[PDB]
Design a protein around this nucleic acid. Structure first.
Lengths: 215, 226
RNA sequence: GGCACUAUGGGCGCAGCGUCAAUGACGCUGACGUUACAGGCCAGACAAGAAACACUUGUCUGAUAUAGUGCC
């Protein structure tokens, strides 16, 4: 019977100055044996709160911990550009230890539309028998954006894989990647390859494309 | 601040293999602290793995590893170890060692963390990446800004290091996460947007460096016209 | 298993008995004396010791914990 620590929300999109609250619940009582860590990408976690409400060192005052039964909450009183990491709760009341699955806390900015670019495969890559068609969405906000691969006005599926950056530091935008993979034979069997992007910043879904030998 | 933790000993292992991580306490004595291993599967959160407790040397394991991994300290060496046996692929993560701070100063909080050591479990073998250019089609230049990049395809494992024009031109550069393909290899691509006046005038060459296979590639990106 | 009764530290000597030594030292055993003084035993709660457990120490609460002898 492990103690589970159900963190929520999984995500959080706020803007600077905001009051932010992150909750976590223990499937059983853990007394006050609860820690809070902040983790920025690629780096190790930093302790913020120990014993469910005491603030570890180096932690500014805007951070603060709280317990009520089995309900543990971290609250940031006024969000600062530095306080934009993922956040985890931990129970240390029994073994085995448990963590939340985390809370990603993202910056909120004005709605920005994507500048859409499209790339055929290389001659080097076709020299070797596979075709990767790569489309780019650049410096937009928010995150959610659909990309639709039509080859000769026909929707594709499953032969393409997306990929998204973390939010920028300066303008706090996103960028997304999509790659249609084909055998060099299937690539040479068609002329029109198109990349269809629907995003909030766009009044009408923007499209980019190319012919096969187009030069 | 002289307190430090340093992990080592990771890398790629076949399934069923074994790997032994170290953790090098400098700035305090391991003898008097509880020492923990926490892993972080890539793209995931933190999962606790094990701890050995001070004085009694009593140890504790995660349900998922309880039987394959073994935690141990060598007080004479001020190093705690992790013996991973009979590895499975879902054991792939960055592995961190962490110190539990002093009972009367941080409770049971983990107050100092290592750097993390990456461990991949795969029966896939090493593969250097093939680097193809996404050429800037100045065929279209609206905001006087074309996008160019390098596709870094079909490598294993990761990481990869993509500079651009040897460290200069860091601005507007968007290197993307790798993605696992149905093959079982990774692929990622890095881009940079630039003025399309300087298209030709400036020349653009991405600097790929996949040390797991000892490949230092450089690829030039440029259109090919009629 | 229940009930009764009896015993339970530390020195300090006395004996016996050892081990290495080399006739040295320190153990071990006494319902063997003696004694300033007191403790000792078991368990739980709580605290502290670089301390989640284990260990050691302290306070508090209970009595227990052993053995022996009977009876049931």
């Amino acid at each position: 019977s492990d103690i589970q620590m159900t963190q929520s929300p999984s995500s959080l999109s706020a803007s600077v100055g905001d009051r932010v609250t992150i909750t976590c619940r223990a499937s059983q009582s853990v007394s006050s044996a609860v820690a809070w860590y902040q983790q920025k990408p690629g780096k190790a976690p930093k302790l913020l709160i120990y014993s469910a409400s005491s603030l570890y060192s180096g932690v500014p005052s805007r951070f603060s911990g709280s317990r009520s039964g089995t309900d543990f909450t971290l609250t940031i009183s006024s969000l600062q550009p530095e306080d934009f990491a993922t956040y985890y709760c931990q129970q240390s009341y029994s073994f085995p230890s448990t963590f939340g699955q985390g809370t990603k806390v993202e910056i909120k900015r004005t709605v920005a539309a994507p500048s859409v670019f499209i790339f055929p495969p290389s001659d080097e890559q076709l020299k070797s028998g596979t075709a990767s068609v790569v489309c780019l969405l650049n410096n937009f906000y928010p995150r959610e954006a659909k990309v639709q691969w039509k080859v000769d006005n026909a929707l594709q599926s499953g032969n393409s894989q997306e990929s998204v950056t973390e939010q920028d530091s300066k303008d706090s935008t996103y960028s997304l990647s999509s790659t249609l993979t084909l055998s060099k034979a299937d690539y040479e069997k068609h002329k029109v390859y198109a990349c269809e992007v629907t995003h909030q910043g766009l009044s009408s879904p923007v499209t980019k494309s190319f012919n096969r030998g187009e030069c | 601040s002289e307190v430090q933790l340093v992990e080592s000993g990771g890398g790629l292992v076949q399934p069923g293999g074994s790997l032994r991580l170290s953790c090098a306490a400098s700035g305090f004595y391991i003898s008097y602290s509880s020492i923990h291993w926490v892993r972080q599967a890539p793209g995931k959160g933190l999962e606790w793995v094990a701890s050995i407790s001070p004085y009694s040397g009593s140890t504790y394991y995660a349900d998922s590893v309880k039987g394959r991994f073994t935690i141990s300290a060598d007080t004479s060496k001020n190093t705690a170890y992790l013996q991973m046996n009979s590895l499975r692929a879902e054991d792939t993560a960055v592995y961190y060692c962490a110190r539990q701070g002093y009972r009367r100063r941080s409770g049971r909080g983990f107050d100092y963390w290592g750097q993390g050591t990456l461990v991949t479990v795969s029966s896939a073998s090493t593969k250097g990446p093939s680097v193809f250019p996404l050429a800037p089609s100045s065929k279209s230049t609206s905001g006087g800004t074309a996008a160019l990049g390098c596709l870094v395809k079909d490598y294993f494992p990761e990481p990869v290091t993509v500079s651009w024009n040897s460290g200069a031109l860091t601005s507007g550069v968007h290197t993307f996460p790798a993605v696992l393909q149905s093959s079982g290899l990774y692929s990622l691509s890095s881009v940079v947007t630039v003025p399309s006046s300087s298209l030709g005038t400036q020349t653009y060459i991405c600097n790929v460096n996949h040390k797991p296979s000892n490949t230092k590639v450089d690829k030039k990106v440029e259109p090919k016209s009629c």
